[PDB]
Design an enzyme around this catalytic site. Structure first.
Site, PDB file in Angstrom:
ATOM      1  N   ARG A 156       0.807  -1.221   0.000  1.00 26.52           N
ATOM      2  CA  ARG A 156       0.000   0.000   0.000  1.00 26.52           C
ATOM      3  C   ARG A 156       0.844   1.277   0.000  1.00 26.52           C
ATOM      4  NH1 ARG A 156      -5.721  -1.671   2.959  1.00 26.52           N
ATOM      5  NH2 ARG A 156      -6.059  -3.153   1.233  1.00 26.52           N
ATOM      6  N   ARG A 193      -0.065   8.673   5.352  1.00 26.11           N
ATOM      7  CA  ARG A 193      -1.298   8.867   6.107  1.00 26.11           C
ATOM      8  C   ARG A 193      -1.660  10.332   5.950  1.00 26.11           C
ATOM      9  NH1 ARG A 193       0.121   8.070  12.218  1.00 26.11           N
ATOM     10  NH2 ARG A 193      -0.244   5.832  11.771  1.00 26.11           N
ATOM     11  N   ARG A 242      19.766 -10.792   9.998  1.00 25.94           N
ATOM     12  CA  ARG A 242      20.507  -9.574  10.276  1.00 25.94           C
ATOM     13  C   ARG A 242      20.802  -9.570  11.761  1.00 25.94           C
ATOM     14  NH1 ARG A 242      22.237  -5.253   6.970  1.00 25.94           N
ATOM     15  NH2 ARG A 242      23.565  -7.046   6.438  1.00 25.94           N
ATOM     16  N   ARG A 259      19.478   3.971  14.042  1.00 27.47           N
ATOM     17  CA  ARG A 259      18.686   4.756  14.949  1.00 27.47           C
ATOM     18  C   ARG A 259      19.317   4.802  16.329  1.00 27.47           C
ATOM     19  NH1 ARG A 259      13.409   0.847  16.215  1.00 27.47           N
ATOM     20  NH2 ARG A 259      14.755  -1.005  16.667  1.00 27.47           N
ATOM     21  N   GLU A 268      22.373   2.058  17.325  1.00 27.17           N
ATOM     22  CA  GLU A 268      22.042   0.739  16.806  1.00 27.17           C
ATOM     23  C   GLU A 268      22.615   0.506  15.403  1.00 27.17           C
ATOM     24  OE1 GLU A 268      17.972  -0.510  17.477  1.00 27.17           O
ATOM     25  OE2 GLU A 268      17.813  -1.004  15.342  1.00 27.17           O
ATOM     26  N   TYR A 307       9.580 -13.252  11.929  1.00 26.57           N
ATOM     27  CA  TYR A 307       9.575 -12.141  12.871  1.00 26.57           C
ATOM     28  C   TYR A 307       8.199 -12.123  13.505  1.00 26.57           C
ATOM     29  CZ  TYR A 307       9.445  -7.644  15.177  1.00 26.57           C
ATOM     30  OH  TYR A 307       9.257  -6.627  16.113  1.00 26.57           O
ATOM     31  N   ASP A 367       5.916 -10.212  16.685  1.00 30.44           N
ATOM     32  CA  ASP A 367       5.781  -9.263  17.776  1.00 30.44           C
ATOM     33  C   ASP A 367       5.444 -10.029  19.062  1.00 30.44           C
ATOM     34  OD1 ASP A 367       6.430  -6.875  16.308  1.00 30.44           O
ATOM     35  OD2 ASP A 367       4.321  -6.467  15.855  1.00 30.44           O
TER      36      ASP A 367
END
Ligand SMILES: Cc1cc2nc3c(=O)[nH]c(=O)nc-3n(C[C@H](O)[C@H](O)[C@H](O)COP(=O)(O)OP(=O)(O)OC[C@H]3O[C@@H](n4cnc5c(N)ncnc54)[C@H](O)[C@@H]3O)c2cc1C
Length: 383
Positions: free
Chosen positions: A173, A177, A249, A279, A300, A348, A350
Site C-alpha cells: 500500500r 497517512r 541480520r 537509529r 544501533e 519475525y 511481535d
C-alpha cells in the site's frame, strides 16, 4: 496424567506455554542458556542511572487482540504509552510514518489532506506498468525525493540490500497517512509494563509447577526424560546447522550514558547511508512516569549475522526459504517436540503475536491429551 515437559527458552513463547501447562497440573521445566529470563524482551535497570533499559532494543507493546491484552494486564501494570518516531535525514527532522506534517515539511508546503493526496499522486512515478521491484513500487507510490529520503538508505542499512533487489511485495500500500496523527502503530491496545517485561515474564513464570534453570544450554540427549519438548531455540541450530545457517541480520548496540537528555524522544531514525547507525534509542523515554537525570542510549547498527551473533531479523527471501524447507522436512519427521517462536519457526513475531501463538500452542497440546491424539510439530504455518 501429569506430563513432564521440557521448554527450551524463557522468553514469551516458553513462559506462556509453560504457565498454561503448569496450571493444568503438568510438571514444566524451563531452561535458558542466558543468565536471565525474558529472551529478547528482557529489560534491566541500569545501576548507575536506574533507567529501565530494553537490553535487546526497543520493545513497544501493541495488540488488537483483546485476549492477549487482558493476559498481559494480569501479569503487569500496563501504562498508557503511544510510540512516536522521529527521523533525521537531509539535515532535517521529520515525523514517521510519512504523514501530513512530513509532507508539508518536506516540500515546504501547507497542504490540507486532499491537497496532499493530489501532491502524492502528481509526485508518484507514472511509468512502470507493473512494478516488479520495491524500488519501482516505492517510486510509483511516492516518487523519487521521498523514496530516496525515507526508503532507499534505510533499506540498504537495515537489510544490506538494494531496494531493486527486493520484490514489489514488500510495499502493498501507499505508505502515507493523510492527516496529522503521528501514532506509529494503529493497534487498539498500546502500553508499556510499569516495571518492565522482565517482571511481567517473571510473574508469568511464577508457578509451583514451573522450575526455571538459567545459564543452561539444551542438550539433545535430555529429550528422552520428558513427555514432550517445546523448543523456542533456532531451528537450524537444533540440527547443528547441517544444511547451513538461516539468513539473519544482527544488531550491535553501542551503550552510552548522557547527563540530561540526549535526543528528547525514545527513538530517532537516521535514514541516510551517511549515518552508519540506523537509529538511536533513549530508553528513559519508554518510562515517562519515571524521572531520570542520567540517560542510557543505544546507537544501533545493522549487520550480517555471523556465527557468534544473536539472530534478530530473519531475511526470508527465496534462497533462505529454500534452505528452511530442508530443516522443515527434517523437523516434520520428529515425534515428541514442537518448535515455536521467532527462532523455532524463522519468522519475525511481535510480543503480542508470540503470546497469542503460545496460548494456542498450549491449548492444542492440552486438547491432544484429553482427545488422546498426536501433538503436531508446528501449530502455525511456517512456509
Ligand atoms: C530488534 C527487535 C526489536 C523488537 N521490538 C518489539 C516491539 O517493539 N514490539 C513487539 O511487539 N515485539 C518486538 N520484538 C519482538 C519480540 O522480541 C519477540 O516477539 C519476542 O522476543 C519473542 O520471544 P520468544 O519467547 O518467542 O523468543 P526469544 O525472545 O528469542 O526467546 C528465546 C530464548 O531461548 C533461549 N535459547 C535459545 N536456544 C537455546 C538453547 N539451545 N538452550 C537454552 N536456551 C536457548 C534464548 O537464550 C532466549 O532467551 C522485537 C524483536 C527484535 C529482534
Amino acid at each position: 496424567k501429569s506430563k513432564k515437559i521440557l521448554i527450551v527458552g524463557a522468553g514469551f513463547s516458553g513462559a506462556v506455554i509453560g504457565r498454561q501447562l503448569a496450571e493444568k497440573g503438568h510438571q514444566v521445566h524451563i531452561i535458558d542458556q542466558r543468565d536471565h529470563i525474558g529472551g529478547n524482551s528482557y529489560d534491566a535497570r541500569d545501576s548507575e542511572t536506574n533507567v529501565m533499559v530494553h537490553v535487546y532494543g526497543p520493545h513497544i507493546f501493541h495488540t488488537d487482540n483483546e485476549t492477549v491484552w487482558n493476559y498481559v494486564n494480569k501479569h503487569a501494570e500496563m501504562m498508557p504509552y503511544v510510540n512516536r518516531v522521529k527521523a533525521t535525514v537531509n539535515g532535517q527532522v521529520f515525523s514517521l510514518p510519512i504523514n501530513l506534517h512530513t509532507i508539508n515539511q518536506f516540500f515546504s508546503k501547507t497542504c490540507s489532506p486532499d491537497e496532499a493526496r493530489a501532491l502524492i499522486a502528481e509526485k508518484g512515478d507514472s511509468t512502470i506498468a507493473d512494478p516488479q521491484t520495491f524500488e519501482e513500487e516505492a517510486l510509483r507510490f511516492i516518487g523519487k525525493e521521498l523514496y530516496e529520503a525515507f526508503f532507499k538508505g534505510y533499506t540498504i542499512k537495515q537489510w544490506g540490500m538494494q531496494p531493486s533487489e527486493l520484490p514489489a511485495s514488500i510495499l502493498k500500500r501507499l505508505p502515507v497517512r493523510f492527516n496529522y496523527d503521528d501514532n506509529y502503530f494503529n493497534h487498539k491496545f498500546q502500553g508499556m509494563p510499569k516495571c518492565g517485561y522482565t517482571q511481567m515474564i517473571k510473574s508469568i513464570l511464577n508457578h509451583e509447577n514451573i522450575k526455571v534453570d538459567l545459564q543452561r544450554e539444551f542438550i539433545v540427549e535430555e529429550r528422552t526424560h520428558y513427555d514432550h519438548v517445546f523448543y523456542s531455540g533456532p531451528l537450524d541450530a537444533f540440527y547443528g546447522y547441517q544444511y547451513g545457517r538461516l539468513g539473519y541480520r544482527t544488531l550491535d548496540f553501542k551503550k552510552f550514558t548522557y547527563q540530561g537528555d540526549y535526543q528528547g524522544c525514545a527513538v530517532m531514525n537516521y535514514c541516510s547511508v551517511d549515518v552508519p547507525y540506523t537509529r538511536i534509542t533513549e530508553h528513559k523515554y519508554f518510562s515517562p512516569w519515571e524521572q531520570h537525570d542520567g540517560s542510557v542510549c543505544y546507537k544501533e547498527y545493522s549487520r550480517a549475522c555471523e556465527e557468534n551473533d544473536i539472530p534478530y531479523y530473519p531475511i526470508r527471501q527465496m534462497g533462505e526459504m529454500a534452505l528452511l524447507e530442508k530443516y522443515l522436512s527434517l523437523a516434520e519427521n520428529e515425534t515428541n517436540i514442537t518448535f515455536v517462536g521467532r527462532l523455532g519457526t524463522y519468522r519475525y513475531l511481535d510480543m503480542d503475536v508470540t503470546i497469542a501463538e503460545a496460548l494456542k500452542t498450549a491449548e492444542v497440546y492440552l486438547n491432544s491429551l484429553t482427545e488422546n491424539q498426536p501433538m503436531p510439530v508446528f501449530t502455525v504455518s511456517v512456509r
